[PDB]
Design a protein around this ligand. Structure first.
Ligand SMILES: NC(=O)c1ccc[n+]([C@@H]2O[C@H](COP(=O)([O-])OP(=O)(O)OC[C@H]3O[C@@H](n4cnc5c(N)ncnc54)[C@H](OP(=O)(O)O)[C@@H]3O)[C@@H](O)[C@H]2O)c1
Ligand SMILES: NC(=O)c1ccc[n+]([C@@H]2O[C@H](COP(=O)([O-])OP(=O)(O)OC[C@H]3O[C@@H](n4cnc5c(N)ncnc54)[C@H](OP(=O)(O)O)[C@@H]3O)[C@@H](O)[C@H]2O)c1
Ligand SMILES: CC(C)(C#N)c1ccc2c(c1)N(C(=O)c1ccc([C@](C)(O)C(F)(F)F)cc1)Cc1cccnc1N2
Ligand SMILES: CC(C)(C#N)c1ccc2c(c1)N(C(=O)c1ccc([C@](C)(O)C(F)(F)F)cc1)Cc1cccnc1N2
Lengths: 390, 391
């Protein structure tokens, strides 16, 4: 009997990623996991036919079901509009989903011992989270541009000069940040550091943008001391604020294995939308539809597409589903599939792009790699073995 | 006889960079070039003693003479104020200089075939040029507004930034004058013509329609009016690209372009290009190398990369040669650059470069040269090159 995986929101995509995603479900997921699958077809032709309604329904389903796994999608431009005879230049599905869910996007790399890194020292992954609008206008000629704060109680009026335009003419803007979104960024970051079991670090440039960045420093520390310090110290983890330059320096000498909150190959990186509630998660590969490889596929040429980032979208999603449902069998599966993926590459079985990382593209010969299907087949074989050895 | 190099403004700096600057002058520049040298000592102690007058004069001289070659200098902080017993926390000389001359800073990397880059495909350098904010905390609920009061007495314009209801946050105001955008466009077109490379402007005009749109419009207006012809005459062009489409292009490219951005260190040069196309100031895109200097102070062996500093001299000397139609100096500036690249490419390099190839834990003493041994090697290869060129 198969593992009962529960409720998962799955989104189908476009081009090469649409092919590999089906191979993942057919060869790696479905032979072992039964899911109450909420499928949405985010393929370009379907978004056009539904007037982008499928994207909104998918976003609402992730809100309801807490777990979303997304395949890469075509973000339309003038050329895509002509190519698919699009009714409109549809907004990116990623933006629509982000806007409906909110949360912080964390980008984590998949580390392989035989695959080179930017810094050889990096043995454990570095998870980077970026913060998650503005009033811009033209200054037609000379005169003063000021920004003013007036409290609701009306007991004060502070006025700061932005600039006194003298030779005159230019541009000016006003931008803000509410306390809640700084807190949401801290909560997502603290909950991310607990789940991964690694220390969290907040980087800032509060030397220049003193007051703006200083609020981020203060809100993080207050949230830590008031609801996180206990569990961090009780797991050998910690929270520490570092300045941009002191952070980039310490990370260059580090072994990795930390959460990096930022206030400002390729088939080996994932992107995870972590909502502040710690309940909802949306996982996806941090790469596109791989158009070039799709064109080769359409011309009958052999392709060697890296499916790792897409497999890790599934494993991260399933691992979160297992955490929410206290499902040990699913938790074991998600991790076993991650181990099989790493082990296969470390054993010398990989796609062209990875062989190119090691040897160098001009020194890569057919025997140095596996094609899309050969690679998927080797993963499926290795997963059967690892799972049979229960 | 030596080459008559003409008028050059030279600024002496601090720490390890001051030591190497003297070696470049003695071993590489002075044995071949005679200059009408306008030397200013921008060492911390001298700036303190003259109450920062030396810095203001140095910038004044670059305005008059058009060519500036600068050594890295200490920007003081509380620790530096105590270390030297400074009268003030003096403002960065680079800040004082830039403010006086105006212009755009362009960062270019020196490429060696045996030294790894971000994208291995990057054979030709990528020259990046970069283009003032009032921030405060919002304690609780209330209105944040941004106003424009015309100087001609016409109606005041008020924009709501945010009405904080749940209360609490942070706010800021930014601006940009048209003259600054015009100067940014000019320096960029000037830089692209000089290198004979295409120019790209990256902006976020989809989000910042009015703000970044003024940048896109000003660059096109200037391009179409005074640069379209000259660019086409050199089989070169200028194009606006949205940030994301620009990074995707650059990563899939072989380099060899200028990038106007509206947002090892031993191998990076920083060049300040004034909008006039006549005034240029060059320096290494790195600091004084305090760490190596302390070792030198304790009589310990150092291995400091002089490339960035040598290229400050070469870019300055190439600009001087261009202004004065001085073929001999133009040839010398190129020869010094080639001898620097070729020396590294032959296996003779400093520790940081050896570490790029082999990795810091695997670096042995036999893989690199100390500061002096490297300068001696460049000196020896420079003498050979210039002798061979006589044909
Ligand atoms: N999250 C999303 O849904 C998302 C994100 C970005 C872009 N896109 C969309 O995808 C389409 C095309 O994107 P693109 O060609 O710009 O970017 P891309 O799909 O990331 O791929 C660009 C290149 O990077 C390499 N690459 C990326 N993923 C790979 C993998 N798994 N295995 C092997 N090589 C891989 C390939 O290089 P080589 O050709 O050198 O092997 C590929 O041609 C667009 O229509 C865009 O809107 C979607
Ligand atoms: N444009 C300027 O004038 C400028 C710019 C930045 C900083 N600074 C000033 O310089 C002082 C200290 O600088 P810093 O130590 O922060 O920065 P830095 O001199 O750029 O170098 C920092 C570290 O990077 C390595 N490094 C940099 N340049 C190198 C080279 N040419 N060859 C070999 N290794 C090199 C060294 O580390 P290893 O020991 O690991 O080799 C060095 O200790 C400050 O007081 C600051 O004000 C000036
Ligand atoms: C895409 C990105 C930047 C995000 N979000 C990102 C997120 C996570 C990881 C990377 C990149 N990897 C890097 O090579 C890398 C590049 C640049 C920088 C910085 C910030 O630019 C620094 F250099 F300043 F540190 C930091 C890390 C791969 C990698 C490799 C090994 C272990 N972990 C990781 N993690
Ligand atoms: C210091 C800096 C960032 C500026 N100003 C800069 C200016 C020029 C060059 C670099 C860095 N080099 C890079 O490796 C690099 C890093 C990041 C990025 C981007 C834009 O951030 C990208 F990542 F988005 F592409 C672009 C280029 C070295 C290099 C190497 C080979 C040929 N040319 C260059 N030129």
């Amino acid at each position: 009997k198969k593992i009962s995986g529960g409720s998962v929101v799955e989104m189908q995509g476009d081009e090469m990623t649409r092919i590999i995603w089906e191979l993942i479900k057919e060869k790696l997921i479905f032979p072992y996991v039964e899911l109450d699958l909420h499928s949405y077809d985010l393929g370009i032709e379907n978004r056009d036919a539904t007037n982008d309604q499928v994207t909104k329904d998918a976003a609402e389903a992730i809100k309801k079901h807490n777990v979303g796994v997304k395949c890469a999608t075509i973000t339309p431009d003038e050329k895509r509009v002509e190519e698919f005879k699009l009714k409109q230049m549809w907004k990116s599905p990623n933006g629509t989903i982000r806007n409906i869910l909110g949360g912080t996007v964390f980008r984590e790399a998949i580390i392989c011992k035989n695959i080179p890194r930017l810094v050889s020292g990096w043995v454990k992954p570095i998870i980077i989270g970026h913060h998650a609008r503005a009033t811009d206008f033209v200054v037609p000629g000379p005169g003063k541009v000021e920004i003013t704060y007036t409290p609701s109680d009306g007991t004060q009026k502070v006025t700061y000069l932005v600039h006194n335009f003298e030779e005159g003419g230019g541009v000016a803007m006003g931008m803000y940040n509410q306390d809640k979104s700084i807190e949401d960024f801290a909560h997502s970051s603290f909950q991310m550091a607990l789940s991964k079991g690694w220390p969290l670090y907040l980087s800032t440039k509060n030397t220049i943008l003193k007051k703006y960045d200083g609020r981020f420093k203060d809100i993080f520390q207050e949230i830590y001391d008031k609801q996180y310090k206990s569990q961090f110290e009780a797991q050998k983890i910690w929270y520490e604020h570092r300045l941009i330059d002191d952070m980039v320096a310490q990370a260059m000498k580090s072994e990795g294995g930390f959460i990096w909150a930022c206030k400002n190959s390729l088939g080996m990186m994932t992107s995870v939308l972590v909502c502040p509630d710690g309940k909802t998660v949306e996982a996806e590969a941090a790469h596109g539809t791989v158009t070039r490889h799709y064109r080769m596929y359409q011309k009958g040429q052999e392709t060697s597409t890296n499916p790792i980032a897409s497999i890790f979208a599934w494993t991260r999603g399933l691992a979160h589903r297992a955490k929410l449902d206290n499902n040990k069998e699913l938790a074991f599966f998600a991790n076993a599939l991650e181990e099989v993926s790493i082990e296969t590459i470390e054993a010398g079985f990989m796609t062209k792009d990875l062989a190119a990382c090691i040897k160098g593209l001009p020194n890569v010969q057919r025997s140095d790699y596996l094609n899309t299907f050969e690679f998927m087949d080797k993963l499926g074989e290795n997963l059967k073995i690892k799972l049979a050895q229960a």
